[PDB]
RNA sequence: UGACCGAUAGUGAACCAGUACCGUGAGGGAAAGGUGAAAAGCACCCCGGAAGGGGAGUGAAAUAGAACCUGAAACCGUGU
RNA sequence: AAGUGAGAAUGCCGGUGUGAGUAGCGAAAGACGGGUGAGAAUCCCGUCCACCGAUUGACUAAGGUUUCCAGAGGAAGGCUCGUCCGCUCUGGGUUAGUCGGGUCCUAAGCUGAGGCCGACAGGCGUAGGCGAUGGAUAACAGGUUGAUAUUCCUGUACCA
C-alpha cells in the first residue's frame, strides 16, 4: 500500500495561503484513519510530519445541464510538517 | 349569483363598444424636432 | 386641504420634504405632494425675513433639528443657512416664492412627476 | 395548530428499517413483493 | 427594412395593416382556501406591422 | 408463423417506468415516438441591450428552421 | 371474415371558451440626495424619521440536507417591478487528547443456549446479551478570514 491511499492534491486559493504556514492538503481514501496517512507521507516524501487534520465531505446534488444525478464523497486531510519542504506545486 | 346562461360573441362584443383609450394632446414643440406633453417639457422638445 | 396617510404620518412627511427642499435647492416628487409643500415652505421663508428671536423659536417647531450641511464643509444646521442665506436673498412680495415644472409620468405607476425649485 | 407526523430519525429506523422487517416472517414477505415489483427503495 | 432593402422614402410612408395573433400560453397554479387550488394562464402575442406608400 | 395491435391501440412501461408525483406505513401509480437523402443546423449585411425579425445563402422544397412529415374542428383576429 | 356505424350514461381523456379586464394581490412609516445601467417608486451608498423592545434580541437541541461564500445572467421563477435574489451557470467552503457522541455502567422494556406449551406457523421463559432521557471520565486569555473556531495560530495548563 502507501501509494493508493493518496489520490490528488487540492490546488485552490485557500491551500496556496496554507503553504506559507507549511500546511499541504491532500485527497486521501474514505477508509484510511489519521495514522495511515502519517506513514504514507513520511515515506513517499521522507519528511518528519508534526500533526494531521481530516474532515468528511457529503455528496452534492447534480445539474440541469445533464440529468438528475449525484456526486462522489471526498475526504480531505491537512498534513503539516515543521522541518521538511514541498513535494508538489 | 351565477350566470344562468352563457353570453354569445355578439352580446360580448356589444359590451366592449366604449372600452377604449382616448388620443393625447400632442403639443408639437415650436422648433426642436421633438414632441412635448400638453403643458409639460422634455429633454428633446425645446419648447 | 389634501391627505395621503394618517394625521401623524402626514405631518412628519411634510416636515421631512420642507427640510429636504431647504438644503438641496431643487427636488422632484409627485404632484399632490408638490402642491402641499408649497404652503409650508413659503411660511418658513416669511419667518426668516423678520429675523427676530420669537420667529427663530417658532421656525424650530417644523424644521428638523439635524441634517448638518455637508456641501458647506462646516456645521450648518439648516436654520442658520435659512436665517442667513435664504432670508438674505429674497425681497419680493411673495416672500419665499417657488415655481413648479411638470414632466412625464413614472414607469412604476402613473403618478405625474414634477420638480419644485426655489425662486 | 399541532398537526400529525412528527419527524424523528431514530424512531423512523425503529418501527421500520431493514433489521426490523427481517426479524419476522410476515414482514419478510413485504421485502419480496417490493423486490419483485422493482421498487428502487426497500424500507 | 424599407430604407436598406428598398431604399424608399420615410416622410411619404403610411402604416397599412397592424394586428396581433395569439401564441402558446403557460399553465400555472395558485393555492386557494380549504385545500383546493385554481389555475393561471400566461398568454403571449405575435404583434405584426406592415408599412406601405399608398400604392401597390 | 398470424383474414393479431400500429402510439387514447399493444404490456402499467416503443422515450427520462415501477420513474415525476401521493401516503407515517402496507401501498397507489402517470404524461411523453416522426426536420432532411446527407447538418449541407441560416457565412455575411440592416433594426434591437438581447429575444426576434427583413434581405442573402444551403436544399427538390425554408408557409421542412429543432413550437421542425401531413395540420381537421372548437376558439381568436385583419381586409372586404 | 368481423374489435363494423355515436348526440345524450351528474360517461373517461385532451384542447379551448363564457363569467371579465371582473374578485383578489395574505405582519413596522417612510422622505430626499448621489451612483449604476438600453430601461429604476422596487438594486447600491448617505443623512433624517419610525417600529419591536421578557422581544420580529442572543445562544444550545430536534428536524431539513448545500438553501452557505465569490464571479457571471435568458428567459422560466418571485401574486407588480428588477440592473436584485433562499432561482439558473462556473469555481469554492466544515481542521478537536480535553466540545457534543461512540467507548465504561445500569432502569422500563426487547431479545434469550439448555427448558416448558402448541395442528404447523409459532407463543412463553432461566443465567446471559442489548438498551439513556440518569451515573463515572481532562481548558482557558487573546489574535486573526469573502466563507471555520474552546477545533487554525499565540501564550499557558490538565488527563491517559
From TrEMBL, chain A:
The keyword Transmembrane does not apply. GO terms for molecular function: rRNA binding; structural constituent of ribosome. Gene3D superfamilies: 3.30.70.330. It comes from the Bacteria. The keyword Amino-acid biosynthesis does not apply. GO terms for cellular component: ribonucleoprotein complex; ribosome. InterPro entries: Nucleotide-bd_a/b_plait_sf, Ribosomal_uL23-like, Ribosomal_uL23/eL15/eS24_sf. Keywords: Ribonucleoprotein, Ribosomal protein, RNA-binding, rRNA-binding. GO terms for biological process: translation. Belongs to the universal ribosomal protein uL23 family. HAMAP family: Ribosomal_uL23_B. Part of the 50S ribosomal subunit. Contacts protein L29, and trigger factor when it is bound to the ribosome. One of the early assembly proteins it binds 23S rRNA. One of the proteins that surrounds the polypeptide exit tunnel on the outside of the ribosome. Forms the main docking site for trigger factor binding to the ribosome. This is Large ribosomal subunit protein uL23.
TrEMBL record, chain C:
PROSITE patterns: RIBOSOMAL_L17 (PS01167). The keyword rRNA-binding does not apply. The keyword Cytoplasm does not apply. GO terms for biological process: translation. It holds the Pfam family Ribosomal_L17. One of its GO terms (cellular component) is cytosolic large ribosomal subunit. Keywords: Ribonucleoprotein, Ribosomal protein. One of its GO terms (molecular function) is structural constituent of ribosome. InterPro entries: Ribosomal_bL17 (IPR000456), Ribosomal_bL17_CS (IPR047859), Ribosomal_bL17_sf (IPR036373). SUPFAM superfamilies: Prokaryotic ribosomal protein L17 (SSF64263). It comes from the Bacteria. Signal peptide: none annotated. Part of the 50S ribosomal subunit. Contacts protein L32. Belongs to the bacterial ribosomal protein bL17 family. This is Large ribosomal subunit protein bL17. It comes from Staphylococcus schweitzeri. The lineage of its organism: Bacteria, Bacillati, Bacillota, Bacilli, Bacillales.
TrEMBL record, chain D:
Keywords: Ribonucleoprotein, Ribosomal protein. Gene3D superfamilies: 1.10.287.3980. Residues 1-43 are annotated as: Disordered. It holds the Pfam family Ribosomal_L34. GO terms for cellular component: ribonucleoprotein complex; ribosome. One of its GO terms (biological process) is translation. GO terms for molecular function: structural constituent of ribosome. The keyword Ribosomal protein applies. HAMAP family: Ribosomal_bL34. Belongs to the bacterial ribosomal protein bL34 family. This is Large ribosomal subunit protein bL34. The lineage of its organism: Bacteria, Bacillati, Bacillota, Bacilli, Bacillales.
